[PDB]
Amino acid sequence: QASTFTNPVLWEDHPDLEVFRVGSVFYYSSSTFAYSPGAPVLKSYDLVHWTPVTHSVPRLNFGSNYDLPSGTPGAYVKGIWASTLRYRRSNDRFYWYGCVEGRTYLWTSPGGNALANNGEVPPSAWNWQHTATIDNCYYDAGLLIDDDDTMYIAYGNPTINVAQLSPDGTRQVRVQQRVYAHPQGQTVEGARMYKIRGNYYILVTRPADAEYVLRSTTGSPFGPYEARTLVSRIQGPLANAGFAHQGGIVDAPDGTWHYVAFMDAYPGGRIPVVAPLRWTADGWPEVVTDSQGRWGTSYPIPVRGAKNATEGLASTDLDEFRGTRFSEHWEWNHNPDTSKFTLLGGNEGGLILRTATVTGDLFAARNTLTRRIAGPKASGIFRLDVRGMRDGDRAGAVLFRDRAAYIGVWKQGNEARIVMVDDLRLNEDGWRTASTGRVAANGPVIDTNAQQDIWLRIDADITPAFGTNTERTTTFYYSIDGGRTYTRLGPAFAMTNSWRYFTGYRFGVFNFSTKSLGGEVKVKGFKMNMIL
Numbered sequence: 087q088a089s090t091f092t093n094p095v096l097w098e099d100h101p102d103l104e105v106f107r108v109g110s111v112f113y114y115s116s117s118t119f120a121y122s123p124g125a126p127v128l129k130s131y132d133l134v135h136w137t138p139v140t141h142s143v144p145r146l147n148f149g150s151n152y153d154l155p156s157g158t159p160g161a162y163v164k165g166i167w168a169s170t171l172r173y174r175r176s177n178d179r180f181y182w183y184g185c186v187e188g189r190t191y192l193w194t195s196p197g198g199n200a201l202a203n204n205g206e207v208p209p210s211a212w213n214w215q216h217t218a219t220i221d222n223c224y225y226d227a228g229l230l231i232d233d234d235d236t237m238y239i240a241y242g243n244p245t246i247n248v249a250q251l252s253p254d255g256t257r258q259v260r261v262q263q264r265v266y267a268h269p270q271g272q273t274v275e276g277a278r279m280y281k282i283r284g285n286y287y288i289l290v291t292r293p294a295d296a297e298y299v300l301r302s303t304t305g306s307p308f309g310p311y312e313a314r315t316l317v318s319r320i321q322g323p324l325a326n327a328g329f330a331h332q333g334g335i336v337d338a339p340d341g342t343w344h345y346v347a348f349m350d351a352y353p354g355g356r357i358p359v360v361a362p363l364r365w366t367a368d369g370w371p372e373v374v375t376d377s378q379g380r381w382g383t384s385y386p387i388p389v390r391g392a393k394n395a396t397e398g399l400a401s402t403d404l405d406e407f408r409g410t411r412f413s414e415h416w417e418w419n420h421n422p423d424t425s426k427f428t429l430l431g432g433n434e435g436g437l438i439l440r441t442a443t444v445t446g447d448l449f450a451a452r453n454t455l456t457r458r459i460a461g462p463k464a465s466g467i468f469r470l471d472v473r474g475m476r477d478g479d480r481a482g483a484v485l486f487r488d489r490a491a492y493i494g495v496w497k498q499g500n501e502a503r504i505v506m507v508d509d510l511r512l513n514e515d516g517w518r519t520a521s522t523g524r525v526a527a528n529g530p531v532i533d534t535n536a537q538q539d540i541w542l543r544i545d546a547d548i549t550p551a552f553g554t555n556t557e558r559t560t561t562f563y564y565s566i567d568g569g570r571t572y573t574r575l576g577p578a579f580a581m582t583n584s585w586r587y588f589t590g591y592r593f594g595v596f597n598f599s600t601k602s603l604g605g606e607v608k609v610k611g612f613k614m615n616m617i618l
Contacts, residue, residue, distance in 0.1 A: 087391045091134040091360070092384045093323035095346075097461035098401065099355020099590035100128065102168035104228070104278060105336045105346045108197075109205030110392075112336060114346075114358075115142065115171035115182065119589055120161040121417040121456065122146045125169060125182055125193075131392035133336070133344055133360050138414035139397055140212040142171060142182035142193050146421050147216055149187070154420035154443075157450035161420065162488075162517040163587055168276060168332075170229040170239070174255075175201045181231075181255055182214075183239065185224045192218040192255065209397060218256035222249065228277035228288065230307070238307050240288045243275035244268075246300070248288075248308050262308035266290070266300050274298065278334040279307075285369065286311075287335075294350060295319050295329040299371055314370050316345065322380035323359055327351040327550035330359050330381050335371065338388045345373055353487075353558055353581045354461045354548030355590020361385065401460050406611040408435035419454040419486065419594070426453055437609040439597040441479055447522045448480075448490065448510055451598035455609075456486050459591055461548040463617035466593035469569065470495075471608040472502060473537045478601025483542035485560050486594040488512040488587040491579040493542050493562035494596075495532070497605070502537055504529030506562050506576030514586045527576035529564060539610075541565040543572055544593055545617060551583050560591075 102117035114128040114136060123141035130136045143166065146152040151161040169184030178197045183190055198211025224241040231237050237251040245267040250260040266288070268274055276291035286302040288311060296318040300311035319329055328350030337343045343363040348356045361381055362374040376382040399405055399413045409431055426442035442452035459466070468483045475481060475497035482494020482505075490510035495502050506527045511520040532540065543563040551558055559578035565571060581591060593614070597607045 089387055089390065090384050091387050093359040093382070094349065094351070094357045095134050095360050096128075096136045096358055097354065098357065098458040100126070100358060101348060101356035101588065102276075103333050103346060103348060103358060104169075104171050105334045106172060107205070107336050107338070108173050108200055109203075110339060111205030113171070113173070115169065117168055118166045118417065119163055120146070120152065120165040120420050121589070122152070122421045123417060124166045125171070125184065126414065127171065129395055129397070131395055132387060132389035133338070133346065134387060135394045137395050137397055137400070139207070139209070140195070140214070140414065142180070142195070142214055143184075144214050147191065152421050154450065154452050157445065157447060158512065158519045159517040162449075162512065168226040170227045170278075172229045172231050173197060173200065174231055176235050181229065181237075183224060183227050183229055185227060185241075188223050190220040190222055190224040190227065191216065192220065220257060222258055224249070226275045226277050228279040230279035230281055230286075232281055232307065238279060240277040240279040242277070244273035246274065246277060246288060246290060246311070250307070265309035266311040266313065268292075268313075276332045280335065283369070289316065289334060291332040292318075294331055297331050297333075297347065301370070316371065317347070317373055317381070320373070320375075320381050322376070323383040324349055324351060324550055326552055326554050328552050333358070335363065342388065343371060344388055345371070350552050350585060351461070351548075351550040352552040352583050352585055353591050354459060354550065357461070360388070401458070402614050402616060404611060404613045406435035407437040407609065408433060415457045416455055417457070419456055420452065423452045435611070438606050439481070439595070439609060440606040441597055441599040441603050443598050444600070444602060445598055446600050447519050448484065448492070448596060448598070449512055449519050451596055454484065454486065454594050454596040456592040456594035457612075459546050459548050459593055460614060460616065463545075463547050463549065465615045465617055466544045466546065467541055467569070467613045467615070468595050469539065469541045469610045469612075471538050471610060472497075472540055473534060474606040474608070475502065476599070476602070476605035479597065479599045479605040481597035481607045482595070483544050484594045484596055485544050485546060485579065485581070486592045487582065487589065488514065488517075488584070489582040491560065491562070492596070493544070493564060493575055495537075495540065502532050504532060504564050504575065508576070508579050512587070514584065529573075529575045532566060536566040539566075539568060541569045541572070546591060546593070548591060552585070554583065557581055557583060
């Protein structure tokens with residue numbers, strides 16, 4: 087058995103993390119902006135091996151922009167920002183709170199008696215429902231369920247506030263403003279709140295390079311709070327990925343604490359790293375560094391020999407869209423038009439994407455289905471049947487972000503042709519479309535037999551390059567011999583290192599029309615291979 091682990095623990099974009107433990111299970115909640123479903127939950131038995139198990143927000147309920155009714159700016163880079171999740175033992179219910187455009191939304195799910203089953207939730211038990219809307223802006227919320235079952239939320243920017251909730255968690259009953267302000271006027275945010283051995287602690291970030299630990303000086307959850315540095319511009323564990331910051335702390339079954347932070351590993355996104363904590367005699371947590379004062383590239387494993395938790399498909403497992411619902415790896419760009427896709431299900435599987443939007447702009451198209459890229463290098467392959475495309479349809483495999491490119495098929499009259507398109511751009515100023523794309527290369531006309539089984543492959547390099555002037559490249563390929571041989575199409579595509587869109591690069595499949603609705607493609611399957 088492995089006795090150590092290496093950082094990062096998961097090389098996939100899961101930002102604004104919250105972590106906690108129920109029995110033997112660790113849970114991890116991340117932010118997802120306008121991707122739908124939102125607010126994924128991952129589980130691990132050891133803080134190292136994570137698997138996605140549910141989403142707290144099955145359809146984004148924050149207004150009609152989230153349905154992408156009429157093109158950009160839609161709700162791009164709005165939606166779910168840093169939010170919070172905890173498990174309530176007393177009623178066996180998970181509570182997810184997230185502030186979206188000035189209001190805070192509560193989504194809850196029963197836990198299938200998790201408290202009594204060592205923290206396990208049966209897959210069939212998850213059932214997330216919109217439970218309340220609180221008309222308070224809990225920006226960068228951190229929920230605490232206190233030992234007496236009173237619920238508190240720390241929040242704010244650039245100073246921290248603490249609100250007390252009603253017993254059912256649906257309204258605010260008390261608030262203390264400005265429980266912490268930095269004495270040199272520095273901005274703090276990213277609150278996570280804890281009750282630990284009789285005391286209240288709040289973890290906050292100084293964006294985007296430091297984490298401070300606050301502790302209540304009075305013993306009251308309303309503070310006031312004083313601060314110590316947890317990390318500040320710490321080196322490691324990865325180069326060209328900004329600094330470890332934000333995240334949260336959690337204890338293992340053996341009682342040892344750990345700090346789970348994330349790095350700005352653009353162009354891949356923001357990815358978790360883990361370090362042990364020790365506690366000073368006066369009750370402050372400190373990061374255990376390597377012998378050189380760095381966040382270690384490797385540490386002892388927090389929990390040893392724990393079977394991984396194969397609850398559904400792994401990130402790199404072939405997915406032929408079998409059974410009743412999407413695996414937890416998939417999220418749509420904005421809420422999907424549910425009338426325009428079909429998960430066929432059963433042993434054969436297959437996903438039908440009927441065109442949902444008439445547009446010349448990929449960023450305006452409904453029903454683009456996306457998933458995270460695993461780093462540092464990965465190949466995403468989609469296998470399609472495109473015989474059902476109609477005149478004016480465009481469909482394919484997209485490397486999806488604010489600067490995007492795809493390999494796809496364009497159906498014009500009775501001609502289906504493979505194309506590579508680049509220069510698909512959203513303006514960072516307001517997220518309106520800047521460019522609807524350039525056909526960088528034409529591939530072959532494909533006959534009906536090739537249309538029946540076309541494989542489109544994206545080789546993405548997400549090796550961190552944040553804060554450098556080196557842009558990583560992605561290359562595109564197609565196969566019309568059943569995935570045996572691939573042909574490179576088009577130039578290498580340079581990827582942006584910008585943080586402004588927040589979400590990392592993703593693999594996606596899209597299908598829209600420039601002329602009229604009616605056509606469809608079938609996605610037979612997707613596979614991600616790690617490029618070693």
